[PDB]
Amino acid sequence: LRLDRLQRGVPIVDGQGRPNTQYQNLWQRTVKALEADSAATADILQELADQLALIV
Amino acid sequence: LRLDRLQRGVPIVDGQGRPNTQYQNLWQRTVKALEADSAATADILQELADQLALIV
Amino acid sequence: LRLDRLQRGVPIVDGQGRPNTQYQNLWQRTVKALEADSAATADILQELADQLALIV
Amino acid sequence: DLAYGTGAYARTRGNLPELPLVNLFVEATRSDQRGVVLQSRKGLVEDAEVGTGPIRGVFRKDGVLGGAEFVVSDDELYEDGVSLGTINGTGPVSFAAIEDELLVCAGESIWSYDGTTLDEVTFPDGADVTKVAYSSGYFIALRAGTGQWYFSALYDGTSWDGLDFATAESEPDALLDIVVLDGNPVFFGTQSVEFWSATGDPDIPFAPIQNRTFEQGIFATGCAVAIDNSFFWVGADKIVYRNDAVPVAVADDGIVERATGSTDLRLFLLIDERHKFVCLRGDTFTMAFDITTNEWCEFQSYGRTNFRCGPDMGDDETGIIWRFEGYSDNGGVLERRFRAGATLPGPFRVNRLRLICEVGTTPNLSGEYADPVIEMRASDDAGNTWGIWEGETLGAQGNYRQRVEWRALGLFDDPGMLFEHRMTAPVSFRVTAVTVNGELGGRSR
Amino acid sequence: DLAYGTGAYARTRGNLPELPLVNLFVEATRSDQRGVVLQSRKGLVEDAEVGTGPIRGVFRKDGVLGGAEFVVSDDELYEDGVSLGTINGTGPVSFAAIEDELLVCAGESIWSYDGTTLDEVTFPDGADVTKVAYSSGYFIALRAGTGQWYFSALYDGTSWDGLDFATAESEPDALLDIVVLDGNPVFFGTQSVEFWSATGDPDIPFAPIQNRTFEQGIFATGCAVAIDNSFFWVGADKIVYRNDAVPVAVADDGIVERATGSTDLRLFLLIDERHKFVCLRGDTFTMAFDITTNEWCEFQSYGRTNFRCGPDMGDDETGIIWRFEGYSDNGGVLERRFRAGATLPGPFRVNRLRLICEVGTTPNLSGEYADPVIEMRASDDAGNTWGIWEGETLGAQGNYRQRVEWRALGLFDDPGMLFEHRMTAPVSFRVTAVTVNGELGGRSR
Amino acid sequence: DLAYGTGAYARTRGNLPELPLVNLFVEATRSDQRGVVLQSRKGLVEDAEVGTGPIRGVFRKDGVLGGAEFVVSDDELYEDGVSLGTINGTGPVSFAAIEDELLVCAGESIWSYDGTTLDEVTFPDGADVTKVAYSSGYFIALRAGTGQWYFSALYDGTSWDGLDFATAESEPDALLDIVVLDGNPVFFGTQSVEFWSATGDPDIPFAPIQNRTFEQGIFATGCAVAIDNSFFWVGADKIVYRNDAVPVAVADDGIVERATGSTDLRLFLLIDERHKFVCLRGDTFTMAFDITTNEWCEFQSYGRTNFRCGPDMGDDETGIIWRFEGYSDNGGVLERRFRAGATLPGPFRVNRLRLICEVGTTPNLSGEYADPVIEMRASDDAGNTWGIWEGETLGAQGNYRQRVEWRALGLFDDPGMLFEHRMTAPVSFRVTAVTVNGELGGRSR
Amino acid sequence: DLAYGTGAYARTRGNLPELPLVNLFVEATRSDQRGVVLQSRKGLVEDAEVGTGPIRGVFRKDGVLGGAEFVVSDDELYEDGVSLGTINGTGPVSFAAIEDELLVCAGESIWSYDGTTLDEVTFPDGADVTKVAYSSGYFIALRAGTGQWYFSALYDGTSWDGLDFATAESEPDALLDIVVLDGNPVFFGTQSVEFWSATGDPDIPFAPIQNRTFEQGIFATGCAVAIDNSFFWVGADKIVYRNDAVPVAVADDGIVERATGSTDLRLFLLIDERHKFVCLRGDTFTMAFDITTNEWCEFQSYGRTNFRCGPDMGDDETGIIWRFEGYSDNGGVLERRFRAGATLPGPFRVNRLRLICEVGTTPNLSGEYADPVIEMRASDDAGNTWGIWEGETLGAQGNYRQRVEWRALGLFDDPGMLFEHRMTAPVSFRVTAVTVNGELGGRSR
């Protein structure tokens, strides 16, 4: 769940420049968190527009 | 627009360790999304304080 | 600290595939921003639920 | 200095010369200047007699249920030699255990043992389960004939929900195997290999790793093993593949020839002191790929069409579990065969053929094996036709200066010379080098 | 010129020639064209006598509790030679220290000392703790028999909460060891190796690093050592592995074969001026792996079945703490043995054997060791049978121009020649080169 | 062509031959075919005589306080030779300056100078400060005896808050040193090396770099420098390490052996035209490691047990500041000693020993140094016992065709030959090559 | 075959042999097997005579202000030979222009020109401006004596706001230079180098790139140039560095030795058709480092202590603008000097010295230079003392078969031979190879 940091002695890249499984999955997790948080922000905006009118 | 994910057989690094155009631009997009999302959160905070004031 | 881009002529990977200090700390900043802004979004959700309960 | 075959290379296409390696494997050494030697495999000795039929699977985990022995003799489950119940049949047996729960699958249904009783597990829709594994606190089961796999609750194997399933989108056919690599499940189907990782989200526990799949499927169930931070599998084209950014084919042309001639393939793992053998077993052969040396050897049992030791060190037709000790194969004969030789551009005279091997290390002093006999047999037409076996003595116990040398082999011509050496004594054996026309010296040996 | 065994290679499988290196290790040098030499390990002298029984662990940090030493002789704790109390437990002893508090674990209980009194630490459920470590301001305790590990309060080790625990999800069996690498905990279980990192969150202080586990679990408690931003641990298959991108087996076939014959293995650290020896100790052997030269060697103590110095320079029989000084083992005899040989394709006459070594460095002008004796014996059957010992002298003090020559030996044949050199004098010894049939010139040496 | 010692290799363990390099360093050259030449270090000439005591530190920044000479003599602070006050502390002196403030730490208290008055800086709890540095607008001070460091306000070193503090979690003992690498602070403790970065936050100015630490420590305060965007530090095991993804021991076995014999080690910096010397100074030695050539050399002062020049070009006994000028050492002599040798398999005759070096470059025409004398001394027993010095003339001024030759040196047997060359004249020196049994002469010279 | 000095290597420390290259540079070629040749730099020809005092800077951009050039003569700005005004400041001249405005900085104040009149730019606090530049739509000006840099408005350099400033936090001393590398500013201070990047945020337009700073500062203003996505700058230790992953010292010992003898150093740029020379100019020398060949050379002007052409093709004792054309310096004499030498183990007889070079390419049929003269002198003491120049002819126009030979050179002893070749004709020149003791026999050349 928690986004991990890059280890000092662990290689994130293979010999030919391709990313290994660990770094690929870490990037996948980071991008998924990006999309989920952006969707949450959009929902916040929409319901704020709903409630900006609700209280008034 | 959508944040891409790293490919298994596509190298993101060159021979000398520098990042290629694809990975550089993808990181640019990711960081730009970070800054835009943070700005949206700050605007949410400001507008929410304004909302508290107006409902009170 | 503003999130930095990837430089064309600067290597982010060492000879053996490990990430250097600059890229490691840049990833650390990016992930820290992720966690901080996710916590901010969670706080927004909580205080917004409180706003709905108490104000309306 | 003749060069012997470092790996089993038996390619029948084009009538290429064959270099079999029977019960011998290449091992790196530091004492000899050549670096590598041929070491004999250890014989099979019975460790425990469980059941009355072939062993399908053996489970022994110290931290699970007190470290009891779980053996599937035919269609029965035995705990430390005590019968527990009847298990379903045809399919291969897979185990998945935690500190207090053990799930056994035989290709038809799931059976749960918690240390008290063996109970059949009710599966959604009553479907058949092919493979059962454990990963990140969940139990994973493959439904037979479908491309969807189910996951159970947290640390509970008897609680399966019909809605707790995930489908491999990129593989429209049915899945066949699971391998737990790096703590994450990898799914082998008939058309693709899928990498899945645990996301920690309670509702959806596993998510696929996008842009990471292999277009080669798996041949059947039970053809995938995990070892050395990687996994080996048998593709739909009957070629053994290693896990990598781009999977490589560790099986040469001869290995694929042998695999194609058989209808059933099973991939398992055997352990020697430092050697990890990925063993591929067919109907009439059993080859082993060495992890440390990246060479293929052949294991055979005398008097039988195939190697006795099956998966998980179990017998193939009897209730005997084996172990490696004393090169006395079930109290019988352990055959070690190999081939050396070379190609020649013209005539070549062979006057002496010396074999730098083990001498004087037999533990027998009153038996027919006090002095073992090793037979060499020569051929000139690339091994197609052979001469009469000629036997030499490895020396009695203590004779550490024995010379294993043939004399006056004769003229050999353009196709080349090929010598086959075979020893069938239950004693230790090792071949260092084969020399042709060696120097004629010595001192009262 | 003869090539000696640069590393201890004693493989009894296959009856391969053995090249044992006893109390000698390879070190790179700049003064010799060859570039490497064999140097003797320093002798053991008594730094301090504490307790009566064997030393189970020594702790010494200058900044912790005023720099006083802590020794677990048998089942008691001693500080500055004064007994603090009785420690219960029979396993390896682990220390975890902070500015003002020290925690000692012996296998079943945790004991705390703060400079005033020694008190038993109250643990949740009264469970047994295998070992205790410290990381990022927290104290980590591994519960015996389970895969869950508890963490104490922030800078407080005497307050353990029942809910303050984390479970190794990918491992369904108990954990056995912990190593603090890069300031983060690494958990060695019986089935996998897990990497965990500090989070900075008081609620969840540690989180597991996903997609990095090694299936070669630790053999037993105390078989993991952290050196040079990496770690060496004994796998479940009795194979020593070094931490890398993919773990590599630093133990050759002979080391693994020796380890498999031993039931208990302990991995600890030996320190020489620039040499870090990963010492694996079994029932009857103690083999040290040098990472600077990446080579194996054997440490032996005269008259005993195993090396006297155990973990943390503690005697395994008495209450003596050892330190490296001089070249006398407990004021007695230090043995240095090695082998040099070659494989010959034919007859070879050996007229001279020169041992370019160190000479004339004896600190004794009179007595038994005024002229130290180095003995050599020869073998033709790959070391299986040996001749008599022929001894020469290294010269008295000041005889730097001494020739260590064993001339006039007979003919050697196909198996090869192997000469064993042994020195049993409590003086310094260094081997530079071994040559055969050298030039006969000289100048009044 | 003999091979001379390109680096100082004086290892007394095993009585190995020693190749001392005194006041000479290897430098790459384009003129000759070998590309390596031994060059003399420049002599020391007085630049400023300030203070009646040993010099502890010298500071010079043009943009700070008008570029004034800030030096520290025994219990004394001097600005451009004018005393400012008495500084208390017995440890190494550390400076930290910005445009209008200068902080000096002697190991006990902090002293602030703003160009008007020298004051004492109040510290939280009245504790002692070991080291003071500047980084990213903040002043960092390490508390003595604790693993805590305090950061000052923005550009104000006289204001320190008790809450402005951070702790090195990975190391439970006390910190010892701090360097500034790439604008970020790196902390060296007794058990770990921690990397910290300024994360732009006024409340939390510095945060540690997770998953990046070295298990090695630092021997003592003042044992860390930085040259090539990287830092060299003396580890807790008395081994010099270079910063890298994995730290590398740039100190060979002899260097570590000499370091272990000293109770006090100090790492400082020396600058030659292109050469960056990391100088490790003990109680009786001073070894300089050249960054450009990766080689170790020895610096000595005639008539003294150690090199006169300490850190920051400061004399270790008198308040004299030195500067590399000419070759005369303080108006005295400069000793340049080296060794060239070879290992022989048998007898060898040395008819001529020629030294291709610098000749005819003396600036003296009438003094005793108008023709310098260089002495060669030969040894056959690997340098243990030496002969009598034989003198040769480097030639008068203008004699650029002078040959440095020694004839009829006798026969050298098995152990090898070793020739030591010593030149103690205050004129420029340079060694290009050493040849044995060269070709006969040519034209008149 | 003799190996001539491919690069200018004149090291006076240690009296090493010197191989100076004057007005010649190494270029790779495909015509000959050796691959490289020596080519002579083109002469200086009239381009424009502007002003009277030294040309401190030339600016030319076709898209800026209609493409008119802007030249700074002694205290005077000129456009198309028309003076525009007296400019204040004795520092190096820097230009920063966009399509409608030009800003000139002389070290004291900024001057703005827009095609109508030249005016003084109002700077905050009236502070002195070290240098100005343009980047990403902003104008950057470095405040003199401090570490402050101000940025102007969008595409307007006449409006500078006091609050529109930024600081180099990691650099507590003053900044000295700026280089626009890859659209972004790089700041060179006396002790550190900072990397900054442009941001889209208009409130803060530039942000510092963290964890990338070089501690090698800059010697003075005007010591940094940009070539091929990298920059070359003179460090604080008078060492020329090239930007890489880690800065690389492209100057060997000789370059730094020459630089340390000069008080003022200026780094500028010269351009040939493919050769980009980074030129370091001192008090009495001018040396160009070639980008393509990574090698150094010397540029000299006859009758002057330094190269006549300075930065931006400007002179120092005149106001003439120079361009590369022909091979005559100011219509006078162009000197080409080089050295070819070898080291010998003994006596060597030189009978013929052949110079495979350019022959018969003179543009003059009559006059003094109809037959150009090239002189050679020999030295046996490594260049310390030379013989009398011996002159040959390169051949008249059309004599493409002319042979450049010197006969009966004599005998050269141990120290080696060194031949210096000098030609002082305004004709083209190129050296292909130098040969010793060539083969006799031609054909009526």
Tokens coding F352: 């001529």
The residues facing G290 across adjacent strands are: G277, G295
| Cβ neighbours around F190 below 10 Å, total | 20
Report d(CA F173, CA F143) in Å as an integer. Answer: 12
Report d(CA F316, CA F299) in Å as an integer. Answer: 14
Q: Edge to edge, what strands does the sheet with D76-79 contain? A: D55-59, D70-73, D76-79, D82-86
Q: Of F118, F114, F48, which is closest to residue F76 (Cα–Cα)?
A: F118
Q: Chain C contact for F229, CB < 8 A? A: no
Q: Is residue G100 classed as helix, strand or coil in its secondary structure?
A: coil
CA F18 to chain centroid, in Å, comes to: 21
- Helix extents (H) in A1-56: 21-55
- Does residue E40 contact residue E27 with C-beta atoms inside 8 Å? no
Q: Is residue G195 classed as helix, strand or coil in its secondary structure?
A: strand
Report d(CA D214, CA B53) in Å as an integer. Answer: 58
- Does residue B8 contact residue A18 with C-beta atoms inside 8 Å? yes
- Does residue D83 contact residue D77 with C-beta atoms inside 8 Å? yes
Tokens coding E259: 């380890």
- Cβ distance F197 to C25 less than 8 Å, yes or no, reads yes
Report d(CA G14, CA G10) in Å as an integer. Answer: 11
- Does residue G23 contact residue G416 with C-beta atoms inside 8 Å? no
- Does residue D225 contact residue D179 with C-beta atoms inside 8 Å? yes
Q: Is residue G370 classed as helix, strand or coil in its secondary structure?
A: helix
Q: Of E114, G71, G387, E215, which is closest to residue D181 (Cα–Cα)?
A: E215
Report d(CA E242, CA G155) in Å as an integer. Answer: 60
- In a 13 Å sphere around the CA of G36, the CA atoms on its Cβ side amount to 14
Q: Token match 């083992």: residue?
A: E329
Report d(CA G310, CA F131) in Å as an integer. Answer: 48
Q: Of E425, E317, E290, E35, which is closest to residue E299 (Cα–Cα)?
A: E290
Q: Edge to edge, what strands does the sheet with D3-4 contain? A: D3-4, D336-342, D417-423, D373-379, D390-393
The resolution in Å comes to: 3.5
Strand G276-281 relative to strand G286-290, pairing: antiparallel
Which amino acid appears at position E14 of this protein?
G
Report d(CA D179, CA D177) in Å as an integer. Answer: 7
- Does residue G6 contact residue G295 with C-beta atoms inside 8 Å? yes
Closest residue on chain D to E380 (Cα)? D401
- Does residue E327 contact residue E40 with C-beta atoms inside 8 Å? yes
Report d(CA G83, CA G89) in Å as an integer. Answer: 17
> What angle do the packed helices C21-54 and B21-55 form, to 10 degrees?
30
First to last CA, chain F: 22
- Does residue F38 contact residue F19 with C-beta atoms inside 8 Å? no
Q: Of E199, E136, E140, which is closest to residue E166 (Cα–Cα)?
A: E140
List CB contacts of G367: < 8 A, sequence separation 6 or more.
Answer: none
Report d(CA E234, CA E219) in Å as an integer. Answer: 6
**DSSP class of G19:** B
CA distances from D391 to D153, D352, D378, D405 (A): 65, 14, 12, 10
Which amino acid appears at position D381 of this protein?
D
Q: Chain C contact for B15, CB < 8 A? A: no
Report d(CA E55, CA E62) in Å as an integer. Answer: 20
Report d(CA F405, CA F357) in Å as an integer. Answer: 11
Contacts of D211 in chain B (CB under 8 A): 5-8
Which one of B1, B2, B4, B5 makes the best mutation probe of the A interface by having the most chain A beta carbons within 10 Å?
B5
**DSSP class of D34:** T
Phi, psi (deg, nearest 5) at residue D376: -110, 145
List CB contacts of G184: < 8 A, sequence separation 6 or more.
Answer: G135, G136, G195, G196, G197, G198
Report d(CA E138, CA G295) in Å as an integer. Answer: 58
Report d(CA D328, CA D424) in Å as an integer. Answer: 10
Q: Of E256, E249, E253, E14, which is closest to residue D38 (Cα–Cα)?
A: E14
Report d(CA B19, CA C6) in Å as an integer. Answer: 7
Please work out, in degrees rounded to the nearest 5, the angle formed at the alpha carbon of residue F178 by the alpha carbons of F172 and F182.
Answer: 125
Label residue D94 exposed, middle or buried (CB < 10 Å: 0-12, 13-18, 19+).
buried
Which one of B13, B26, B27, B37 makes the best mutation probe of the C interface by having the most chain C beta carbons within 10 Å?
B27
Which amino acid appears at position D357 of this protein?
C
Report d(CA E392, CA E396) in Å as an integer. Answer: 12
Q: Chain B contact for A4, CB < 8 A? A: no
Please work out, in degrees rounded to the nearest 5, the angle formed at the alpha carbon of residue G392 by the alpha carbons of G390 and G394.
Answer: 150
Q: Is residue B33 classed as helix, strand or coil in its secondary structure?
A: helix
> What angle do the packed helices C21-54 and A21-55 form, to 10 degrees?
30
- Helix extents (H) in D320-391: none
- Does residue E177 contact residue E131 with C-beta atoms inside 8 Å? yes
Closest-CA distance, B7 to chain A, in angstroms, reads 8
Point out the residue among F18, F174, F347 whose CB comes nearest to the CB of E63. F174
Which amino acid appears at position F333 of this protein?
V
Report d(CA D148, CA D167) in Å as an integer. Answer: 4
- In a 13 Å sphere around the CA of G441, the CA atoms on its Cβ side amount to 1
Please work out, in degrees rounded to the nearest 5, the angle formed at the alpha carbon of residue E317 by the alpha carbons of E311 and E320.
Answer: 70
Strand D110-113 relative to strand D102-105, pairing: antiparallel
Q: Of D273, D280, F264, which is closest to residue E254 (Cα–Cα)?
A: D273
Which amino acid appears at position F141 of this protein?
A
- Does residue E19 contact residue E339 with C-beta atoms inside 8 Å? yes
- Does residue F264 contact residue F282 with C-beta atoms inside 8 Å? yes
Point out the residue among A3, A40, A47 whose CB comes nearest to the CB of C41. A40
Q: Chain F contact for A2, CB < 8 A? A: no
List CB contacts of D21: < 8 A, sequence separation 6 or more.
Answer: D5, D6, D7, D8, D38, D296, D297, D298, D337, D338
- Does residue F267 contact residue F240 with C-beta atoms inside 8 Å? yes
- Chain F from 90 to 129: CB within 8 A of any E CB: none
Strand G36-40 relative to strand G24-28, pairing: antiparallel
- Does residue F274 contact residue G252 with C-beta atoms inside 8 Å? yes
Phi, psi (deg, nearest 5) at residue D329: -75, 100
Report d(CA G175, CA G172) in Å as an integer. Answer: 9
- Helix extents (H) in F219-345: 253-260
CA distances from F381 to D228, E63, E131, E400, F378 (A): 53, 48, 55, 6, 10
Q: Token match 């295998």: residue?
A: E130
Question: Hey, what long-range contacts does F360-363 have (CB within 8 A, 24 or more apart)?
Answer: F360/F394, F360/F395, F360/F396, F360/F397, F360/F398, F360/F399, F360/F400, F360/F401, F360/F402, F360/G384, F361/F397, F361/F400, F361/F427, F361/F428, F361/G15, F362/F394, F362/F395, F362/F396, F362/F397, F362/F425, F362/F427, F363/F397, F363/F427
**DSSP class of F261:** T
**Burial readout D279-288 (b: 16 or more C-beta within 10 A, e: otherwise):** bbbbeebbbb
Point out the residue among E15, E18, E411 whose CB comes nearest to the CB of D358. E15
**DSSP class of E118:** E
Structural method: cryo-EM
Closest residue on chain F to C24 (Cα)? F209
Closest residue on chain C to B32 (Cα)? C3
Tokens coding G227: 């070539």
Q: Is residue G89 classed as helix, strand or coil in its secondary structure?
A: coil
Assess whether chains B and A touch, using the rule of 3 or more C-beta pairs within 8 angstroms: yes
Contacts of E205 in chain F (CB under 8 A): none
Alpha-carbon torsion angle F298, F299, F303, F305, nearest 10: -60
Q: Of G310, G412, G420, which is closest to residue G376 (Cα–Cα)?
A: G420
Tokens coding D174: 């049915």
Report d(CA F242, CA F232) in Å as an integer. Answer: 5
- Does residue D164 contact residue D151 with C-beta atoms inside 8 Å? yes
List CB contacts of G33: < 8 A, sequence separation 6 or more.
Answer: none
Please work out, in degrees rounded to the nearest 5, the angle formed at the alpha carbon of residue G435 by the alpha carbons of G434 and G441.
Answer: 130
Phi, psi (deg, nearest 5) at residue G48: -165, 140
